[PDB]
Amino acid sequence: SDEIVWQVINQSFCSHRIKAPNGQNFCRNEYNVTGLCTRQSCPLANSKYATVKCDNGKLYLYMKTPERAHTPAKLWERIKLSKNYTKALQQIDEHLLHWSK
Amino acid sequence: HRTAPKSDNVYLKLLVKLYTFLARRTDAPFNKVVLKALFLSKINRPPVSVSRIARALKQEGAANKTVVVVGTVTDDARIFEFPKTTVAALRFTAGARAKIVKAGGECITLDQLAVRAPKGQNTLILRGPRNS
Amino acid sequence: SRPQVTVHSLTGEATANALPLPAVFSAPIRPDIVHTVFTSVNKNKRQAYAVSEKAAFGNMCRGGRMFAPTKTWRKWNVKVNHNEKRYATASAIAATAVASLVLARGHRVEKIPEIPLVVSTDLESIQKTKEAVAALKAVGAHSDLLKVLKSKKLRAGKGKYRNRRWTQRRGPLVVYAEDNGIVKALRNVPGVETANVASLNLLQLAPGAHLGRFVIWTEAAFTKLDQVWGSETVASSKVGYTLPSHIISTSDVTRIINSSEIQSAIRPAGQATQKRTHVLKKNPLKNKQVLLRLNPYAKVFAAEKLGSKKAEKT
């Protein structure tokens, strides 16, 4: 359904999408990693998803699985990132093992 | 003429994306024919009666072929005996769909057709007889 | 595409009972047809307007008659095929399940128990506003209600003083099998609109022709949806109506492309961006390296210096 949801979001109204003067598009989706609203970018159009996002101080990796397409309250999984920059990038590569580039 | 469907059926554009991946990445002329047929208008997609399908299955060596209709498979009560065969198409009227199922056959969508014959192995394509 | 949905209590928790999907959510989603039907349905509640009949003489003139006096018999209502209208409603109902669409329209549904959200039928028996609002708090649609409540703005047009002064977003839609005072209780809270399963108004379903309004179901209504639209098992309860078919079975094309067997049948791919060759022409007769990618005899030609070769005295 993801490509159907994507073509609805693309060709019709993505509420988060913002149109630049350049022509480029920008999701205001809070989980969107890049600012853009593209095929890979919309968290709504993709069920496997990830995002570095900060709650008040600590930075958390947010994981989204197709397994929890229903129950959006229990949707996002949270991982506390390390304060070591190297260790936290290693943690990213661990939790995104066998995951896309 | 058309290099794109002038329709805005989303599922149709999905099949266009699938068959354009095929018609680029296959070497069989089949998927190119399917792509060119997907662009056709409603006038340029005349319906195909199931009577015409059975009369087509009366051809030699076609009984183990599968049939493909870019268009609509419509029913006709003027036939009684319809063979057990595999028909893939865009749309199925419920009468023709019950004719195919009731004859023990199979009503196939074109995505499943691409899965079964990516190179178009052992197929038939029928076009409705256009007059006007 | 899961089989069943857990009903939720008025206190708001997974009730042990669950209900199978009514297979209406497996309908094709056709936003083109929803759009074309929505325009014509939105053209229905319209009152005509006109200029006066006879009330110089020029369209260019001050006070003269205008060019094209607007007459009443211009078409106002638009006839729609009934199956097509039902198809648009079916695509809207199927779209309400998804909730990536509901977020794509803009709703605050990020903390709700599941989709499609199903509450017990006891919700129908609430007859007071504060209790039903507390019930929707217990659900978790509170943030959507607060969005609607903050969203009350004044209309920018002249139509502000044409009795259309205020505007605000739309919120949840509550679907009931039967009224037991629920429609009076939710009448006062803004943004909420109730609907019997028999009607299911498309304007209430996909407002602004955007698919997937946030819809709340009662338990009996969710069962009753099978009665309303039928299935392959339950008939239709509509005369000669069928829940319509798909032209493609699998909704994901990239799954089909990357499956195994297409991936078997397909030639190897390119670089996915073209390697530019010969971006600029380097002339021979100078630049002797590109002279040496051509004509390897030129090296021994210069080595023997045959251009200045002395002939025999014969």
Added chain:
RNA sequence: CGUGGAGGUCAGUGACGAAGCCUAGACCGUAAGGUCGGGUCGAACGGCCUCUAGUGCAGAUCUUGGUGGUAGUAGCAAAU
């Protein structure tokens, strides 16, 4: 590209100043045009996806209004 109105949305902007006006102020557009600064100003108004039209002016000796020169001239009941 622009204009009036309509549905949805941006929990869009706004009396710490909306809209409008001016701008020998800057910027982006091939252009239609758009964005900001400053000044003035006082109460509403925009972006996006769609709908709808009484939707774009230099002329028509066009309509209406305002203001020139003619000209302190003609001339002195030219209206008083």
Added chain:
RNA sequence: GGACCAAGGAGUCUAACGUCUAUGCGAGUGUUUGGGUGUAAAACCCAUACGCGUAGGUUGGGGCCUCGCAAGAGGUGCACAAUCGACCGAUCCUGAUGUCUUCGGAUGGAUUUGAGUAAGAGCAUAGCUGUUGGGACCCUGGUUCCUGCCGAA
């Protein structure tokens, strides 16, 4: 054709046929005269009618299959076209078996015939447009944004 300037100011609406496109259903299709319903000119459901439509061969030939490393070869052949057919209706002669003395068409011919048979495609809605009529672009004159592409007599 013009003193200047501001505002206003000129292809709108409707009806009937017509092409194209999109959409739903499909030999069917068309809810909204009307009834039931309703949160009330909305939406939802629909009885009986009615409307419009429905009621052989050869040569190729998209492809497809086989074989061939390939090139090619063989086979089955969509749409459509040409041929030779056939049949129906007509066409002008034959005028039997019978025959109420004028009835009859049996059989065999002959050319063309026809949106003919020899296995349907339409209905409805919307959009853009063609012709006609309603004041119908406005009053001979005027007729309101940009860019790109094609572009005659």
Added chain:
RNA sequence: CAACUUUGGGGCCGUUCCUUGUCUAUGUUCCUUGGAACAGGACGUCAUAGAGGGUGAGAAUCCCGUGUGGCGAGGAGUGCGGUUCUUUGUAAAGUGCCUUCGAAGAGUCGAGUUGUUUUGCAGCUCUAAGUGGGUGGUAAAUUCCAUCUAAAGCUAAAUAUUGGCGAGAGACCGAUAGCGAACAAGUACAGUGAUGGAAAGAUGAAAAGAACUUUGAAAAGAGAGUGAAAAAGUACGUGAAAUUGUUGAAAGGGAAGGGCAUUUGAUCAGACAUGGUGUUUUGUGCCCUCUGCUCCUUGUGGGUAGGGGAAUCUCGCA
């Protein structure tokens, strides 16, 4: 003849209908800004009431209402519902069977003509029948069959309604538009008349509409003051262009405009930029250690407490 079957008229009180009257929720809680909070933020309550309007700016909760119900009042009235009073007099009616009878639209129907209409109507002349007459099919024909009763009359509802009396709405126009007329508009005015027929909306929240002094015939000033604002002064929201005046600059001398390109003159813009990498000092904490608690999506999880330590290590921070 046989039976059966039936009774009418009032009153009154309700009900029904109309016209009204009255009652029926919840913040004016703190902060900022503002001349004014009805704005913004924080915390609330009501809701069968978050329609709308007003109140010095976007007011559910300030007010009126709105919503839900309640209590009245005065009429209309037979619509019915109870009570209550009477109604019979060989009164009136109905059904089956038997017997005896068993009366209907004329200057009309019709015919001709003329006009009119597209067959009716009207005029003129003529003018009937009673198992009659009207009308239509029908034929195997010296036809059969069908179907109504003209020339007297009344009759609700479904229907039309650019008028009246009221409502309620609008993908309508927003003061050259929309009615001619948002305003003392069919007005002022014009015409002898019949008739024609304009222009003209916005001070401010409150007039708080400028006390007082002074110039000035008088008109207008100048001081002064009100006001958040006279960059709102009854010429008044905002205040464009055409056009005018003054000053400054420049050019011109019977000079017209632009396009390119450059100087000169004038002028404007032109960091809230001020960091990174590595090392080192000390201190601190989600750092270390020990002891917990808690949420489920139960895992490669999330939140969170207590005491100790950096004496050593190590991370982040300083």
